[PDB]
Amino acid sequence: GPEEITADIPNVGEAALSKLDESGIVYIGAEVTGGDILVGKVTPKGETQLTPEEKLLRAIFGEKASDVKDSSLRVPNGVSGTVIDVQVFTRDGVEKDKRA
Amino acid sequence: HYIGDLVQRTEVELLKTPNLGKKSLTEIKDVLASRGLSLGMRLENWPPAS
Amino acid sequence: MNLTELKNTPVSELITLGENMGLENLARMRKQDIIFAILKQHAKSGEDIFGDGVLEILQDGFGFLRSADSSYLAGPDDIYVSPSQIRRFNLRTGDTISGKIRPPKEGERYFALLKVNEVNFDKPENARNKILFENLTPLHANSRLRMERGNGSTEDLTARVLDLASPIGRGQRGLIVAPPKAGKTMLLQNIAQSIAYNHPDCVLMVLLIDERPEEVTEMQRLVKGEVVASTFDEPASRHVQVAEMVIEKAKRLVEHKKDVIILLDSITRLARAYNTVVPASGKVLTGGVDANALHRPKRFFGAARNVEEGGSLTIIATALIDTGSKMDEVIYEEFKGTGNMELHLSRKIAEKRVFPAIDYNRSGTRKEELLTTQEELQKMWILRKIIHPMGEIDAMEFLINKLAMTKTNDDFFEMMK
Amino acid sequence: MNLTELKNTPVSELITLGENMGLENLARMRKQDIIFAILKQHAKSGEDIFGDGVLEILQDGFGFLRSADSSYLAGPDDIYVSPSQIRRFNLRTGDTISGKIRPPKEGERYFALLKVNEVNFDKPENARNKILFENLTPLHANSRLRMERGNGSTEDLTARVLDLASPIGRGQRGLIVAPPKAGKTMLLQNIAQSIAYNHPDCVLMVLLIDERPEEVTEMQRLVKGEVVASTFDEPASRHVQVAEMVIEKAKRLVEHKKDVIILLDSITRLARAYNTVVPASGKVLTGGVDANALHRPKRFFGAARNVEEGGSLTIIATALIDTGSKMDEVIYEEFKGTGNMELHLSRKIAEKRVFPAIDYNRSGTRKEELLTTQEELQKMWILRKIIHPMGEIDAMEFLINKLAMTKTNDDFFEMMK
Amino acid sequence: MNLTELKNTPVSELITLGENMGLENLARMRKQDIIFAILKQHAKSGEDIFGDGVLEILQDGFGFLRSADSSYLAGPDDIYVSPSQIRRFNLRTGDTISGKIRPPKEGERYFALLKVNEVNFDKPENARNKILFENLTPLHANSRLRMERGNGSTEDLTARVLDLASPIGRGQRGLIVAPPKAGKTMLLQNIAQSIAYNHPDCVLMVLLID
Amino acid sequence: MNKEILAVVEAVSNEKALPREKIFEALESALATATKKKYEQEIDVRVQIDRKSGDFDTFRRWLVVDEVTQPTKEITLEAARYEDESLNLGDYVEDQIESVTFDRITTQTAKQVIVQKVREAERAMVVDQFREHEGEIITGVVKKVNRDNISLDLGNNAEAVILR
RNA sequence: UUAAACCGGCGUGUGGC
Ligand SMILES: Nc1ncnc2c1ncn2[C@@H]1O[C@H](COP(=O)(O)OP(=O)(O)O)[C@@H](O)[C@H]1O
Ligand SMILES: Nc1ncnc2c1ncn2[C@@H]1O[C@H](COP(=O)(O)OP(=O)(O)O)[C@@H](O)[C@H]1O
Ligand SMILES: Nc1ncnc2c1ncn2[C@@H]1O[C@H](COP(=O)(O)OP(=O)(O)O)[C@@H](O)[C@H]1O
Ligand code: BEF
Ligand code: BEF
Ligand code: BEF
Ligand SMILES: [Mg+2]
Ligand SMILES: [Mg+2]
Ligand SMILES: [Mg+2]
Incomplete structure (x- = not known):
């Protein structure tokens, strides 16, 4: 499977998801102090060889798997700041999100 | 105003308090009892600060 | 106070009463919406409202108190009934309940009934300890319900003819088989008026399904008793709703040992609605009717019965023929064998401006000896013997002429001498 | 100024008026687009425009003032109505509103109505304090609406025959059951002309649904009154839009105690559109019609009624038969039982070039004694008695010959002597 | 005990018997539901109930003991019959079976028949070793079943006429061709009464459909 | 939705x-x-x-x-x-x-x-595949033994237990 | 067998002392 930036982060508080937008990238002008999610890069990890029921189930429930992987960038511990510019670049063929 | 008197006020005076219904009572139960406190506790030393 | 107490009167008194209550412009919203706002304000005055209505049970377990004047339909004044009452008393569908109600707090829906004070015009103790309706012992019509008025009107004959064609009694199951443009409307009108005037002891419950709203207004304010109807303004869903609701009200009232007359017109449109609201079984019958489309209509039709213990349920449902297609006729067929009382009306004679054109030949009653005394039965047998060998037009003109030449039915017997 | 004041006249006067206003080439854009640009310039001159239209309410709460000449459809001159007016007066659908309007600033959509000056040709105070339509008391046709013209034309018979077959009055619900190529067009044409000429007091509202544009142009500029139509150029969405909009306009006009005649042709295409715009319930009926596909058509049909307080709504909707399939016939069936006024036309006689071919046998009116005087009713009864025993062709040729041999209807009575 | 033993009597005796059993208000539920609750309590007293009914076989292989008074229909007192009995004795449809039954544990459905004690009013040994019905040799009516009552009633003629029109006997196949409103009801009534009074040896099974 | x-x-x-x-x-x-x-x-x-x-x-x-x-x-x-x-x-x-x-x-x-x-x-x-023989002698091999119960297999993934 | 708790390797370049 590929890598996604869906803002549906599992096992995280709502206070950490408050800064995020609908896409998964924080708006231009929201300051951050501690380690706070600003890219919603959660992706599957679950291996193949799943029974047909598992595959049909994860297909009928959208595109969801062992997505619990955090795999998200936060600010380094110790540095504050205020985001003022976001830069995103997609590979030819990959669908462009609304923020791009 | 102060819960120093509401600590001596159990849950039997919640829905008898005027206009405590579904969502206001929900907030009262949530933001009070989740912070380690219990709604209604017997004590005898709140006046003398003891 | 009571909703019907505000409902018997037009929207004008409701408007001035709301102006007394000091609210927003009432005439803008609907008059039943006016009643909702008015009861909300009355509850705001710090008093417990007293409401009443018949119970409708959904899948969730709670209930709705549908009002009589709202045609037993969904309304903003339908009192919510918490499941706890169904746990304590287990009030079934059709139970007329009156009790204390409170206003709906915000985010709620309607008024909630706190405590029941009256169960079917009786103490609540009889509600729990009572014998059920489908648990009764059905019987035949023992007591005779006379139909003639007694002062000799022109449509009074329309009642006398029944007493001369086939008697009608408590607990009977009557069918009225007639084509369109035959004279069913005025017939059931004077039938209800005669039942009310001559027999005010029984509970007159006239029913109307899918007719003109002008007909509903003419029926409601002409006859004695409650008039619930559902015209074409409501789909098959509300049709079956009002039908099952009035039938369950009748079931409960018979359980309370009371007599209920249910004059329904027509049964064919009810059957069409039923066939519309049944799941498809992958097959169709002759005429275009589903297989299981007749089960619930047959239940609703056979709900009528005469009871050993107390009360009676007598339904007179009009059957419609000459519709061009088969399915309606099919209904009629499936309904001749279940009802024990047939009454057939003539349109071929009605087009001749010959009223009332009742089919004296194919009319009849099963176990009709329990519906009339001995010598009157002998005389009716001889009278039908006289009526038989003459033609249809002959019998009908003889009927109309010699009965308009009479005033009452026993006077008719004493004149035939 | 008023949009209709610029709409009664063709595109040529609009072009020269825009040239007077000094704008871009007007003939290039559409004539209603011309009117939009012209009103924009007129507002640019520093004056408050005076607009009018009937209200259409969307889900958001605001309204649109659809104009009469635009067939009650979406247009660039549909005045926006802020929700504040619906909060103050609560103007419902169909309320003819006239008042002050402002131009649309950029990034806006259309003109906005500032303050209402006329509500249904009455003061705005009557708009808030008023009794509603579905809140009325429906009744039968009390006042008779004569149809004969009085100077004896050839198609004047087409009105007389109605007065001789079955009378028509205020608040009635009329059906015209006829196959294609029978003579419905000219019939409703002379019916509207006779209603307008002989009874100019009532509001003539002719309706046309899904016909030829040439037919729409022939209808609009031939009869007295407003002519709103929606041909096949518009899908079922705009069909149901114009239908509900004219029916709500009629509801409001009856609420204001006025009589509204709604001549609609045809009801079957309206039912087809309705069946097209209903959600699927996972099942189909006989003929290919959804279950709940008839609820809203039945509402639209039963909107007609006679009122105790004031005003009347009389609809004459034409039913179409001989279409080969079942569903249309199904509609017809579902519509014979709801309307209290039937009128049937003959195509088997129309192919013989025998006009007008009205079915005198199956025509009739319920409670027709309130539609005509006493002795005229006796004479009509005797005349139908004479017409009955003869054949169809016999009755029809007798009708056409002996009525063309007469000039008026009472003259016809005095000649039959 | 036996369900029919509680069924011959009206709902009133069932209500007072349930009050003797000390349960919830019985009159509220149905009388056959009353019987279900009453048998549940009787089983709670620590005794094996004795039930009876005719067998109805579904596709799964188990059976239901439909009772006589319930019109051979689905009811809460339809005794479940485990497939093991159909493996041992192979009781077919219509076999009147009487035996020991137990209460339904929770999450179950109805009472379960443990051991059969009576098979068609006979020992269970005759149930396995027996010649079948469609396996028989059909014949004509040899023995005559007289119909006249013998004391001369008015509807007694309605039996005599049959004996005068066409006799009726055992094993016959009779049709009654009649239009509506002809007199079939009272006819079959006095026919059944005459068969029962004059010939009480045979099993009278009157049937009514719709 | x-x-x-x-x-x-x-x-x-x-x-x-x-x-x-x-x-x-x-x-x-x-x-x-x-x-x-x-x-x-x-x-x-x-x-x-x-x-x-x-x-x-x-x-x-x-x-x-x-x-x-x-x-x-x-x-x-x-x-x-x-x-x-x-x-x-x-x-x-x-x-x-x-x-x-x-x-x-x-x-x-x-x-x-x-x-x-x-x-x-x-x-x-x-459960349904192991039932219909409640109260009959059945053969079975065991999988695990404990101080309070033991597990038993019959075939076709038929799992049962025998308590202490 | 069951329950509870917890879970910079390398090179390069630059700059500074
Ligand atoms: N008893 C009666 N006396 C006089 N006229 C009658 C009588 N019954 C019916 N009619 C006539 O029948 C017409 C209405 O018939 P209706 O009740 O609509 O028949 P249906 O219910 O079969 O359509 C009226 O115009 C009325 O003149
Ligand atoms: N009163 C009449 N006099 C003469 N011709 C008529 C009359 N009514 C109808 N027609 C004939 O009917 C035709 C139009 O029929 P039309 O109204 O379009 O059929 P439909 O009834 O299907 O709408 C015309 O060609 C005309 O000759
Ligand atoms: N022997 C008889 N003596 C007196 N009345 C009879 C006799 N036979 C039939 N009847 C009358 O005929 C009717 C027959 O009804 P029913 O038995 O229901 O006929 P069917 O069975 O054809 O429906 C009864 O109402 C009864 O009054
Ligand atoms: F025209 Be009738 F009421 F069926
Ligand atoms: F073709 Be017609 F107008 F029915
Ligand atoms: F012939 Be009847 F319907 F019993
Ligand atoms: Mg009628
Ligand atoms: Mg036409
Ligand atoms: Mg019979």
């Missing part, structure tokens, strides 16, 4: 092991476990999604007991005056309405609960 859930319940392969009723009660449990994650307040939430008619509508269970910890699910033995509850046990409320709709972790919970429910249905199937 709800049409998607209807499509899922139409597309379930084991409609016979899990018909519509068990499917929407499983979704009841799934939305309960999801609300366990939506709010830090551990509250049991029945939602009666009304599969055939419509969609979910969130409730709140009172969990009648004299305690007060997690007061979203604490009611004494008689606190049934308000709202006309009038019930000691089982009286449950509908305070919070239309909570967080389906999201990805809600679908995760629904997926895991429905697969374990298919497993429970297969357990009912092996």
Whole structure:
């Protein structure tokens, strides 16, 4: 499977998801102090060889798997700041999100 | 105003308090009892600060 | 106070009463919406409202108190009934309940009934300890319900003819088989008026399904008793709703040992609605009717019965023929064998401006000896013997002429001498 | 100024008026687009425009003032109505509103109505304090609406025959059951002309649904009154839009105690559109019609009624038969039982070039004694008695010959002597 | 005990018997539901109930003991019959079976028949070793079943006429061709009464459909 | 939204092991476990999604007991005056309405609960395949032995136990 | 067997002392 930036982060508080937008990238002008999610890069990890029921189930429930992987960038511990510019670049063929 | 008197006020005076219904009572139960406190506790030393 | 107490009167008194209550412009919203706002304000005055209505049970377990004047339909004044009452008393569908109600707090829906004070015009103790309706012992019509008025009107004959064609009694199951443009409307009108005037002891419950709203207004304010109807303004869903609701009200009232007359017109449109609201079984019958489309209509039709213990349920449902297609006729067929009382009306004679054109030949009653005394039965047998060998037009003109030449039915017997 | 004041006249006067206003080439854009640009310039001159239209309410709460000449459809001159007016007066659908309007600033959509000056040709105070339509008391046709013209034309018979077959009055619900190529067009044409000429007091509202544009142009500029139509150029969405909009306009006009005649042709295409715009319930009926596909058509049909307080709504909707399939016939069936006024036309006689071919046998009116005087009713009864025993062709040729041999209807009575 | 033993009597005796059993208000539920609750309590007293009914076989292989008074229909007192009995004795449809039954544990459905004690009013040994019905040799009516009552009633003629029109006997196949409103009801009534009074040896099974 | 859930319940392969009723009660449990994650307040939430008619509508269970910890699910033995509850046990409320709709972790919970429910249905199937001989001698090999019970196998994944 | 709790390797370049 590929890598996604869906803002549906599992096992995280709502206070950490408050800064995020609908896409998964924080708006231009929201300051951050501690380690706070600003890219919603959660992706599957679950291996193949799943029974047909598992595959049909994860297909009928959208595109969801062992997505619990955090795999998200936060600010380094110790540095504050205020985001003022976001830069995103997609590979030819990959669908462009609304923020791009 | 102060819960120093509401600590001596159990849950039997919640829905008898005027206009405590579904969502206001929900907030009262949530933001009070989740912070380690219990709604209604017997004590005898709140006046003398003891 | 009571909703019907505000409902018997037009929207004008409701408007001035709301102006007394000091609210927003009432005439803008609907008059039943006016009643909702008015009861909300009355509850705001710090008093417990007293409401009443018949119970409708959904899948969730709670209930709705549908009002009589709202045609037993969904309304903003339908009192919510918490499941706890169904746990304590287990009030079934059709139970007329009156009790204390409170206003709906915000985010709620309607008024909630706190405590029941009256169960079917009786103490609540009889509600729990009572014998059920489908648990009764059905019987035949023992007591005779006379139909003639007694002062000799022109449509009074329309009642006398029944007493001369086939008697009608408590607990009977009557069918009225007639084509369109035959004279069913005025017939059931004077039938209800005669039942009310001559027999005010029984509970007159006239029913109307899918007719003109002008007909509903003419029926409601002409006859004695409650008039619930559902015209074409409501789909098959509300049709079956009002039908099952009035039938369950009748079931409960018979359980309370009371007599209920249910004059329904027509049964064919009810059957069409039923066939519309049944799941498809992958097959169709002759005429275009589903297989299981007749089960619930047959239940609703056979709900009528005469009871050993107390009360009676007598339904007179009009059957419609000459519709061009088969399915309606099919209904009629499936309904001749279940009802024990047939009454057939003539349109071929009605087009001749010959009223009332009742089919004296194919009319009849099963176990009709329990519906009339001995010598009157002998005389009716001889009278039908006289009526038989003459033609249809002959019998009908003889009927109309010699009965308009009479005033009452026993006077008719004493004149035939 | 008023949009209709610029709409009664063709595109040529609009072009020269825009040239007077000094704008871009007007003939290039559409004539209603011309009117939009012209009103924009007129507002640019520093004056408050005076607009009018009937209200259409969307889900958001605001309204649109659809104009009469635009067939009650979406247009660039549909005045926006802020929700504040619906909060103050609560103007419902169909309320003819006239008042002050402002131009649309950029990034806006259309003109906005500032303050209402006329509500249904009455003061705005009557708009808030008023009794509603579905809140009325429906009744039968009390006042008779004569149809004969009085100077004896050839198609004047087409009105007389109605007065001789079955009378028509205020608040009635009329059906015209006829196959294609029978003579419905000219019939409703002379019916509207006779209603307008002989009874100019009532509001003539002719309706046309899904016909030829040439037919729409022939209808609009031939009869007295407003002519709103929606041909096949518009899908079922705009069909149901114009239908509900004219029916709500009629509801409001009856609420204001006025009589509204709604001549609609045809009801079957309206039912087809309705069946097209209903959600699927996972099942189909006989003929290919959804279950709940008839609820809203039945509402639209039963909107007609006679009122105790004031005003009347009389609809004459034409039913179409001989279409080969079942569903249309199904509609017809579902519509014979709801309307209290039937009128049937003959195509088997129309192919013989025998006009007008009205079915005198199956025509009739319920409670027709309130539609005509006493002795005229006796004479009509005797005349139908004479017409009955003869054949169809016999009755029809007798009708056409002996009525063309007469000039008026009472003259016809005095000649039959 | 036996369900029919509680069924011959009206709902009133069932209500007072349930009050003797000390349960919830019985009159509220149905009388056959009353019987279900009453048998549940009787089983709670620590005794094996004795039930009876005719067998109805579904596709799964188990059976239901439909009772006589319930019109051979689905009811809460339809005794479940485990497939093991159909493996041992192979009781077919219509076999009147009487035996020991137990209460339904929770999450179950109805009472379960443990051991059969009576098979068609006979020992269970005759149930396995027996010649079948469609396996028989059909014949004509040899023995005559007289119909006249013998004391001369008015509807007694309605039996005599049959004996005068066409006799009726055992094993016959009779049709009654009649239009509506002809007199079939009272006819079959006095026919059944005459068969029962004059010939009480045979099993009278009157049937009514719709 | 709800049409998607209807499509899922139409597309379930084991409609016979899990018909519509068990499917929407499983979704009841799934939305309960999801609300366990939506709010830090551990509250049991029945939602009666009304599969055939419509969609979910969130409730709140009172969990009648004299305690007060997690007061979203604490009611004494008689606190049934308000709202006309009038019930000691089982009286449950509908305070919070239309909570967080389906999201990805809600679908995760629904997926895991429905697969374990298919497993429970297969357990009912092996129950049926081992039944019909209750009270008869049966052969069986054992798998594990413990101080309190032992596990037994017969074949065809037929699992049973013999207690101490 | 069951329950509870917890879970910079290398090179390069630059600059500074
Ligand atoms: N008893 C009666 N006396 C006089 N006229 C009658 C009588 N019954 C029916 N009619 C006539 O029948 C017409 C209405 O018939 P209706 O009740 O609509 O028949 P249907 O119910 O079969 O359509 C009226 O115009 C009326 O003149
Ligand atoms: N009163 C009449 N006099 C003469 N011709 C008529 C009359 N009514 C109808 N027609 C004939 O009917 C034709 C139009 O029929 P039309 O109204 O379009 O059929 P439909 O009834 O299907 O709408 C015309 O060609 C005309 O000759
Ligand atoms: N022997 C008889 N003596 C007196 N009345 C009879 C006799 N036979 C039939 N009847 C009358 O005929 C009617 C027959 O009804 P029913 O038995 O229901 O006929 P069917 O069975 O054809 O429906 C009864 O109402 C009864 O009054
Ligand atoms: F025209 Be009738 F009322 F069927
Ligand atoms: F073709 Be017609 F107008 F029915
Ligand atoms: F012939 Be009847 F319907 F019994
Ligand atoms: Mg009628
Ligand atoms: Mg035409
Ligand atoms: Mg019979």
